[PDB]
Structures are given as C-alpha cells and as structure tokens.
C-alpha cells in the first residue's frame, strides 16, 4: 500500500501499489497546451454556408504526426454551415474538437483544437471544395494556412530530482514509474512524497 | 459535466456542447450604469415636482431599448417614494432606490441593467421643476444628475479570441459553455470533459 | 432575489430582497465608536459602598442627544456597591452597558459605555446623592466632570460610488436601501456587487 | 446566558454567567513571554556528570519575583548529568520546565523555561558546588550570568475601551469582570461584543 | 496536554505531553536533501538486460557513512533488466530507493535515491558483473563513477530561539525534547508557540 502527498495543490499526486517510497523535488517549468486554430474571418450567422452550396460532397481531412491514418470528415448533404461543419468533426469523436466563438453580435468564428502536446498539431486540407478550402486548410509544418493559430502546441516540461521530463499531457506518468503527476500551473521547487 | 481552476470563474455547460479545455483571461467586467440626483432631500415623502400639475411622464431611452419607457406619475404625487415606486412597478430593467446620506438627507438613484447598450436618456414631460431634477444625457454626459457608475461591457479571451458582452453571464463563447465572471482574472482554465 | 458579495472579508454584506443589482465602489474613512466612561479613580473592592450609606434611595440620570426620554435608574436598597451600580445599569437593559475592569489587584475601575454614534454621548447626573454624583457625574455637552472620557464618541464615515455616507454604527444600512454593510476596518477601494 | 464574538481570530473570546451583554475596542501591543535559559556551553552526553563529583551534596536555588519561597532543587554525587538535573527540576513540577536540546550528533545543551511574565525571571544559583554553579548561574535583576538569556520575560500589555492594562499571562481575565481573552497576536482596534 | 501552532504552514509542529510551554523563533537556513544517483546513459526499454548475459550472478554493493555494514543486493535469477534491478533493491528495503524515469519516448534512466542528510552518501560496486558496473558503480567519496550526482545530499539546519541545530532529516525532534517539526521550506523568522 502506497500513499503520496505534496507540498502544493497545484500539482495533484497519485500512486499505484508497485510504487516506491521517496521524496521528489518537482520543478514544473512548461504546461502542455492544445493547438488552436481558428477562421481568420468572422461570419453573421452560424448557418451561412462557408463552403460552395454547388457542390453536394467534399471532405476535410486532418494530419497530425502522432496520428496514423488520416483523418476524413465528410460533409455528403451540401450543408457547410459552421453548425454542420462543426457538428461533423465533433461527431466522429477522434481528438478534435470543433467551437463556435461568439466574440460579439453577428461576428462567429470557428474554432478548431487538438489534444495537447507537438504531436498533435494539425494540417488541414479540404478535397472538392476550394471555396471552404480556402477558409479551413492550414499546415502546421511550414506554419503558414488560411487560419490563424491562436494558441501553439506546446508540450509539458518538468524536473524530477534533477532529471529533466518532456511529455504531450499535463499528466505526467513513468516520472518515475509508480507514480501520476497532474500539471496545473507552472510551480517551483515543489515535493512528492511516496511512503508506504 | 465542467469544471474551473479558480472559484471566481463559474462554469455551467449544455447537454450537446464539445469536450475541451479553454484557457481563459478576464480583462474587464461588465458595469451597469448608475444615476444619483445632485441634490438631496430632509424627506423621502415631500413633493419634488410641481404640484400645480396632475400628470407628467418620466421619458428614459436607451441605445438596447426599442419603445421609450414611459412612467407615468398620474396621482398628484411627486415623493421620493413614488417616483421610485413608479419606476420599480414598471419592472422594465430600469432600479430605482433611495440613498439616505445622512437623517433628513435622501438622494434618488436611478440604476440600468449591466452594458453600454443600456445608458440612460432621462427627460420629464410636462413639469419641468421635476425634468430640472432628473434629466439626464449620456450622449454628452450633461444633467442634473451624476453619474455614479460608469455603463462598461465584459471584455475577456478565450484560447487567443478577445470577446465582449453586456454581462457577466457570458454564453457562446464557446456555444454550450456558460460562464459566469465575478473577478478579473489571468490564466484560468476551464476543463469540459 | 438577490446575492452579495465583496472583494475584501474586511467588509461583510447583505441584502434584502428588493436590493437592486450593481456595482458599489466603497472607501471606509472611518469607523463608528462608542463614549466609553470610567470613574476618576480605582477601589479597593467591588463591594464597598461607594455612595452615602445615609440615603435610601437615589437616581442616575443619563441623557443622550439621540434620547427623548432621559433614562433613570435607582438604587433602592441603599447599596451603592460598584457591584450594585453595575447591575442595576445593566438591568435597565436600555443601551449603556456598565462593566468592572481590575486594573490590577485592589485597583477596580468602573466603566459606562454606550452605543456607538456621536447621538449617545452621555450626560450623567445623580439624584439625592451628593457623594455618587461626585463619582458619576459626567456632561459631554462641554466634556466636564467627575468622570473620565476613556473613549471619546465617533460616527462611521464611508463613501459609495463617490457619495459621502455617515452613520452612527458600523452596521450601515439605506445606502442604498436594500445593502446592508458592517464596518470592521477602514478599506481602500473595495467594491460590492449585488446581482440578481 | 451569554455569549461573545470578536472581529478577528487573533483574539479568541469567552464568557461567565456575571458578564452583561456590551462591545470593548481592545488594542493588544505586547504579548507576554516566558523566560527561558540555556547554558553557555554543550556536553557529549546526557549522561555525564556536570558537577563537581567531591561534594556529596548540592542545591539549585530558584528565585522569582512573585515566588514567595525559593525552590530549591538537591543533588546528590549522582545526581548532577543532565538527565538528572532535567528530571529533578521537572519532578519538583514548580512552574520551571528543564528540556534537553540536541544541537547535533553528541551535543548537548539544557534549556530551563520559566512560565509566562516579568514575576517569573530567574535568579539560578548552586548552593556547595561550584562546577555546577558555573554551569547554571544567572541573574535576571543584572541580565548577567553563566547561562544566556533564549527568550526574555515579557508581560501582556493590552487596552480594553481605553484603560490600559498588564497581565501576566495571555490568558487575560477581569478586564472586564465576567470576560476572558486569550491573546495570540499584536492587534489593533479589534472589537469584542457580548449578548 | 500540550498544542503547537505556527506562525507559516511551511513550518509544521507537533510536540509531546511534557514539552516545554512557551514560544519558539525559528529559522530554517537549509533544508536536508537526499543523495540522488542515475545512470548516465538512457535505455530503449525497461525490459532488455543491462548486466552482462554471461553471468549469471553479481551483487550491487552499497556501502555508506553511516550504515555499519554494506547492502548486498544479488542479481540471481536469470533477469538484469531495468525493472529487475530496480525490484532487488526494493525488495531489500534496506533504505535506498530505485526508481524508472521515462525522460521521453524510448529514453528510460535508473535512479537510486538514499535515505537524506550526509551519512547516507552511497559507495556503489557491483562484484562479478563489469558490464552492470559499468553502469552502476559511483563513489561519493572522490564524487566520481558510471553514474551521476542529480542531488547532492544535505543536512537540515535550523535556528531555534538563537540555538543552531543540524539534522540528518526534514523531520527535526530533540529541538527541544518534546517538540517535533517538520521541514517543508526555508523560513525566516518563524514562531511556534507551545500552549498547555
């Protein structure tokens, strides 16, 4: 039976029953962040159709470097308002969240996040649609796109003991093994303690 | 279900809204405009007005108000006490309450709903005595009456988009997510899962 | 209905119901307090007679500026004891409170204290007893007499949305109608929100 | 029938049955403190004796200003190490508490705490062995001595709706009569109420 | 009965029936720190063997300042994996703590942690494995080895009402007898007050 404490609640510990007792000195120096894009231009209404209302099928496919197969969203009714478009990518539930922002009367835009982590950045592309692909694509290798990236990926940076930790998530397992760290701000010199 | 990093930043959310975490700063709250009369009275039932009149109207536009609201004050009756009474009984977003100063020194106040879109024109139709006291323009600042409070809008950023409202229950920002601002605040999170 | 809240626990609030929504900017400049009395000098004891034994009955009067009626309380029983004053003023149970403080042993003081506000500052006079008018006796009117002014009579001074407020206790109330403010300590530029 | 709240946590309050319902500003500007002594040096052990082994018998006179009789505390040849003169004082149970600190690995010191207020400064001295009269002697009156004064005596000094008054003790009865208030903290313009 | 407060949560308190009633100045000018080593070259797994596959036992010998005789962990049973090195010095229990850090994919590092304080500096030698030695052998002595020094081990020292004391750990007792005080952080001029 392992039980874990820490100096501080801005970073919860947890244990399992292989973990060791220890005491850790934990500085967190960067928190993990979700890339964000989000359509350079506003609209009216969230039922204006953004994409060619000619055009009955096209798809929006996402790439991502921890991601193996493409990701293909498809709009087969000839609605491409940013409600059906966001409904769509949220609907097949596969780590990309699409948002509609209110930033005041008659100005929406359309929002777009990954999961955390420099795995996750996205590039979009829209097959048979060059009017909606001209609002959406984005490609985050040359970092250049038709959106704009409002918040960048940015992965979790901590020090355990000396020992400097990369990681996509704010939770931090195998830092060491036996042991689950939740980031939720950026802290200095805090402790973990293991006692069984 | 959603959840917040600090306790002055609330979060409710809907049932078909998106997972996600959203990183949010508040810059500004939303402030309601708040009128006080110059002058002030030894009672809250003596007359205000004129006497010699039966009828007047307190006329009050706003930016967000189509129709002009009309208080009519039909009883001979220009206390304190009634005007306030007659604007509150209106129950058309528009609070009226007494400020007692001191004994025997009570002032009127006249407050909106939060937002710019909700700064107050005042005239008094038909006696002037009592437009001499609660006229106002929030076009040019000018009137008998003071302001109080300043009419400001909510301004605040999520994920890197700066947004703005007329009050402190901000929805569609993302849609689902119903936040609710008492504090201003840098870096907080709010976590949909 | 309504909720309170204020940005500093130094200033607590309430509402009624019909407390209309806002936003109240509020300095405290400074707070009420109470005309705190205490005889001349101390006494060996709490209860040796301290007035003339040959007397049955007598009367202290007390009058305040906020008071229509003077308030009156006899000594009956002949006992003029720091004991018997203490509690015959405390019976009255009309807003001055009598209290014994040992200084240090054999050294008994008495104190009258009433509200707080500049309205209840006290005028002391006694009937049929020269000798506990020679210790009571006290007129604020012109601050003379065979008291001492251990704490001198104050009103609260508060400022909401630039509006200059005075009251005679900490608990403030009809500024506006509807708040309810207890004082506990001067504040600079707190704020008080009521919504809905 | 009564009951008091005050304005801030540093103060806490209570009441008896004789107390009348009022408020008192009390400003708190010193609290009291208790003397405490060590000795200036430090020894290997607990164990060894620290007095003169030649003498059969020996006395630490205790002094304090409202101590009506000294306390005297005797030792005999094997009775003068550390854990001795700790567990003498202490067994006497007279208000002067012995503790033993370890500075580190193999030394030590022993520290004597009076209880609270300026009546209860030490004048130590050894009666027949001089050893352990280097070793413990002090006098509060000169703040002179062998040991060394940790913490000096200091009483509670507090105003109660503008009488000014000083205790012993933290735990402050009779100011007013029917009132008591523990001090914790430095305090200004607090107000305690009774109803 | 006897309670303890303290003027800083970093500083915590709890003292015995017996101890000393009064209040206690304390300064924490450093705070004890345990030796902490790790491998200096990263693995790809957990899994595969680091000790030579030839032998098919050694024993990591540990020796320290102040453990009476050495710990003599054997590696026996046909496993000298990561995990498996790090279970046999678990399992020994013998106050030094193995632990896994997962610096970033495919990067493992073995981390050996002792008790704190400067008695627990580690001497490692690993008898019958040049290969195991290779990577885990340190001397603390002339501060060289095949691994590397993360945390240097340190004392505790602390200040109290003016006496400097030194402790092998953050857990401080004898500071006088009766009190016990856990170290979390440096502080300046803490007090604890001891109440009966």
Redesign the interface.
């Known amino acids: 039976s392992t039980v874990a404490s820490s100096?501080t609640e801005d970073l919860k510990v947890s244990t399992t029953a292989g973990a060791?007792?220890?005491?850790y000195?934990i500085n967190v120096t960067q928190l993990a962040?979700?890339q964000?894009l989000?359509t350079k231009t506003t609209f009216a209404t969230?039922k204006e159709q953004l994409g060619d209302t000619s055009v009955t099928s096209r798809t929006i496919k996402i790439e991502q470097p921890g991601r193996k197969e493409p990701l293909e969203i498809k709009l087969d009714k000839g609605d491409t308002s940013m409600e059906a478009i966001?409904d769509a990518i949220?609907d097949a539930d596969s780590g990309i969240?699409?948002?509609?922002?209110?930033?005041?009367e008659n100005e929406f835009?359309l929002?777009l996040?990954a999961n955390?982590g420099t795995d996750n950045t996205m590039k979009i592309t829209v097959e048979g649609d060059t009017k909606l692909n001209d609002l959406l694509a984005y490609d985050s290798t040359t970092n250049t796109g038709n959106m704009q990236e409002?918040?960048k990926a940015e992965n979790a940076k901590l020090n355990?003991?000396?020992?400097?930790?990369?990681?996509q998530s704010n939770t931090v397992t195998?830092?060491?093994?036996?042991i689950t760290l939740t980031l939720?701000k950026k802290v200095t010199?805090a402790?973990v303690t293991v006692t069984k």
């Open positions: 100096t060791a007792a220890g005491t000195k962040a979700a964000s989000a969230t966001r949220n969240a699409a948002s509609i922002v209110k930033v005041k835009q929002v996040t955390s409002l918040v355990v003991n000396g020992i400097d930790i990369e990681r195998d830092a060491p093994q036996g939720t010199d402790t």
